[PDB]
Design a protein around this nucleic acid. Structure first.
Ligand SMILES: [Mg+2]
Ligand SMILES: [Mg+2]
Ligand SMILES: [Mg+2]
Ligand SMILES: [Mg+2]
Ligand SMILES: [Mg+2]
Ligand SMILES: [Mg+2]
Ligand SMILES: [Mg+2]
Ligand SMILES: [Mg+2]
Ligand SMILES: [Mg+2]
Ligand SMILES: [Mg+2]
Ligand SMILES: [Mg+2]
Ligand SMILES: [Mg+2]
Ligand SMILES: [Mg+2]
Ligand SMILES: [Mg+2]
Ligand SMILES: [Mg+2]
Ligand SMILES: [Mg+2]
Ligand SMILES: [Mg+2]
Ligand SMILES: [Zn+2]
Ligand SMILES: [Zn+2]
Lengths: 98, 150, 140, 80
RNA sequence: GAUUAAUAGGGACAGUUGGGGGCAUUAGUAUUUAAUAGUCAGAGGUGAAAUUCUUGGAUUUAUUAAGGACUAACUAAUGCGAAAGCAUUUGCCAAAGAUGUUUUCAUUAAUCAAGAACGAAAGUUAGGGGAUCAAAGACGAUCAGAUACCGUCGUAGUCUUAACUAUAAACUAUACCGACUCGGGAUCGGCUGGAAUAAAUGUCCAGUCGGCACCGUAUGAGAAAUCAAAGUCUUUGGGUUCUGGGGGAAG
């Protein structure tokens, strides 16, 4: 029978959508389908920043360390296994942004 | 909505109720008939003439005022546009396509589009011929089109 | 670029202008539009440039850009700005010295000017001159 | 509950041109008085072209989808 | 002496919209590879390592160049295209929807055997091109076995011109045209009123045509999953095309 309405993807008008490589397996996945979560990563762990702030050098505009920018793109296959998105129950499958 | 299993809507135009001519305007049928044929002589489409009489000289619907449809007025006054707008134009673009296709002998979307447009023209011929409104030996192939080009 | 050396000293002329990841990735939200204008300027100095511009559409309704807020700008309006931006800069260069141009490019002078011509087409935000490359610099 | 034969004026004023019962257009006609010659010319609410004043040769209206913007300060009565 | 003018259909026209298409042009990093310099013993790759590469200098850092492909981030249940499919700039070439119409034409139309136009990949013929990845192949490793899932390389292809091939879970697995019937906001394109600023190819409020899509719900449908249509079919009949008739052998 049928499991989803969007079958995991958002292709709603067009017949074909660009394919993209998986951040983790390298596998090819259609853009719309594949998981995404472009995150604002930080250069150093918590208590570890303070250590670099005191031994820091250049001016101090209070702008600290540049934060890392990671544009994340997972294919289902590994996205799951990678703790990202856990198999959700029946009616919770339609919930968006919990 | 013609050759379209998927696209379809409603452009506009709904003749107002009151079948008489607007109040404000005064013009014996004849007055208009002059403008109409004069304008026509200059080389105009009954399609375009009517547009003027509405935009320019406040005559909403020549038919309502004369009791005559433009093309008829024109035909009675010798000023009849040989080949109907209908066919004429279709064939025009039908042709324009061919010219563009030449220098772009690879443009496939256009090959297709022309196929549709040429298809229509065969539909008008079938029609206009059956209403003895166009000689039976009429035939649009490439020579019928270039024939009008001269 | 080290252009000349005066014993123990390195003298340098203009070669390139740019930005960084902090800023670039910085102004990049997913509910606005992104515009870019490439330009080949002519300076009276006998210098050829390429200047990249970075434009972003600005909201105007208090609604913090959400999935519900759309700050897109009809592609026709986009190029409308390119056409305007580039055209402004090719004239700006034809009337300046590399010393003046570089000075101006780094300054919020052009951010304001572009902002002026643009609010006419569609109010922008974070305007930048992403990058500048010295294409061909005569050494008269 | 609503009567379909004696429908409110507002309701029908909102509906789409072709949805109203008797079904009539929105377009109208207007006498425009040039900003100079003064000549009063009739122009259609949905002119599909630029219009000149047959007296001098001034510009009266610019064409658009539906509306016709009137050039500068010209006069306009809505004949009806 | 010639019915209206079909919330039927064809044309004219008007601003506008689109990653629709064809020629041009034009970038941008990156991957390779090369020059110019710079050091120094390891690089690379895996769970571990191993073939691999390297002081006739690797990996590495800066500049630059050649080259072939590719268009990131913005790019989303958003857009266009008959479908396949389509995202750097700019300029041409013919085309398209929708909206707007007190413009013409007035059945011109719906669908369709024949009969044609298209139709990613892969594949084929004859030339180009050859950067990356890579069927076959050559190798390492893993295994009781591995010509397999990892790793090192590599030919065809992948790119292109001109021919040919027509299939695909070519999928919404839901034929097209038409009329109806629940609620609701949010969208994309056009239009019409209005308000604030301001006088903006902007913003908002309110309409409304047309286009993806969603939310809620049905004393309507179903075998159910579920369906706003998969509804208005035992209260069994708007028009038309194609298809099936237990399974396997079998497309
Ligand atoms: Mg497909
Ligand atoms: Mg209809
Ligand atoms: Mg909006
Ligand atoms: Mg184009
Ligand atoms: Mg490698
Ligand atoms: Mg290069
Ligand atoms: Mg879009
Ligand atoms: Mg881009
Ligand atoms: Mg063929
Ligand atoms: Mg070959
Ligand atoms: Mg063993
Ligand atoms: Mg390899
Ligand atoms: Mg308005
Ligand atoms: Mg609205
Ligand atoms: Mg059934
Ligand atoms: Mg529902
Ligand atoms: Mg039945
Ligand atoms: Zn993966
Ligand atoms: Zn005047």
């Amino acid at each position: 029978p049928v499991k989803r309405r969007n079958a995991g993807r958002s292709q709603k008008n067009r017949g074909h959508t660009r394919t993209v490589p998986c951040t983790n397996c390298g596998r090819q996945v259609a853009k719309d389908k594949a998981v995404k979560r472009y995150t604002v990563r930080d250069m150093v762990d918590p208590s570890s920043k303070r250590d670099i702030q005191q031994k820091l050098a250049f001016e101090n505009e209070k702008q600290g360390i540049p934060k890392l920018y990671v544009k994340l793109q997972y294919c289902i296959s590994c996205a799951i296994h990678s703790r990202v998105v856990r198999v959700r129950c029946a009616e919770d499958r339609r919930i968006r942004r919990p | 909505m013609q050759m379209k299993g998927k696209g379809k809507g409603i452009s506009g135009s709904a003749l107002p109720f009151k079948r008489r001519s607007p109040k404000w305007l005064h013009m014996t049928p004849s007055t208009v008939v002059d403008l109409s044929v004069k304008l026509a002589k200059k080389g105009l489409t009954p399609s375009q003439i009517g547009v003027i009489l509405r935009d320019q000289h406040g005559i909403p619907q020549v038919r309502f005022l004369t009791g005559q449809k433009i093309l008829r007025i024109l035909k009675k006054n010798g000023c009849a546009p040989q080949l109907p707008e209908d066919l004429y134009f279709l064939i025009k673009k039908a042709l324009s396509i061919r010219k563009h296709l030449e220098k772009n002998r690879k443009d496939k979307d256009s090959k297709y589009r022309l196929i549709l447009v040429e298809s229509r023209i065969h539909r008008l011929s079938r029609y206009y011929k059956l209403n003895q409104k166009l000689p039976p030996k009429w035939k649009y192939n490439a020579q019928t089109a270039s024939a009008l080009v001269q | 670029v080290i252009d000349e050396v005066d014993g123990r000293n390195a003298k340098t002329s203009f070669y390139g202008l740019d930005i960084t990841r902090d800023r670039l990735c910085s102004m990049i939200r997913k509910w606005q539009t992104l515009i870019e204008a490439r330009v080949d300027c002519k300076t009276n100095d006998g210098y050829i440039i390429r200047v990249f511009t970075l434009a972003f559409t600005k909201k105007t309704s208090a609604g913090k850009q959400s999935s519900t807020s759309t700050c897109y700008a009809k592609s026709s309006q986009v190029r409308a700005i390119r056409r305007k931006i580039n055209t402004f800069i090719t004239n700006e260069a034809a009337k300046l010295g590399i010393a003046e141009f570089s000075k101006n490019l780094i300054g919020e002078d052009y951010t304001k000017k572009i902002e002026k011509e643009t609010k006419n087409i569609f109010p922008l935000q974070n305007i930048t001159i992403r990058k500048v490359k010295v294409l061909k610099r005569p050494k008269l | 509950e609503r009567d379909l034969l004696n429908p409110i004026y507002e309701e029908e004023k909102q509906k789409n041109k072709f949805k109203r019962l008797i079904q009539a257009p929105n377009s109208y006609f207007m006498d425009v008085k040039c900003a100079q010659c003064q000549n009063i010319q009739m122009i259609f609410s949905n002119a599909q072209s630029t219009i000149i004043c047959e007296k001098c040769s001034a510009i009266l209206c610019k064409p658009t989808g539906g509306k016709v913007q009137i050039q500068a300060g010209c006069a306009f009565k809505i004949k009806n």
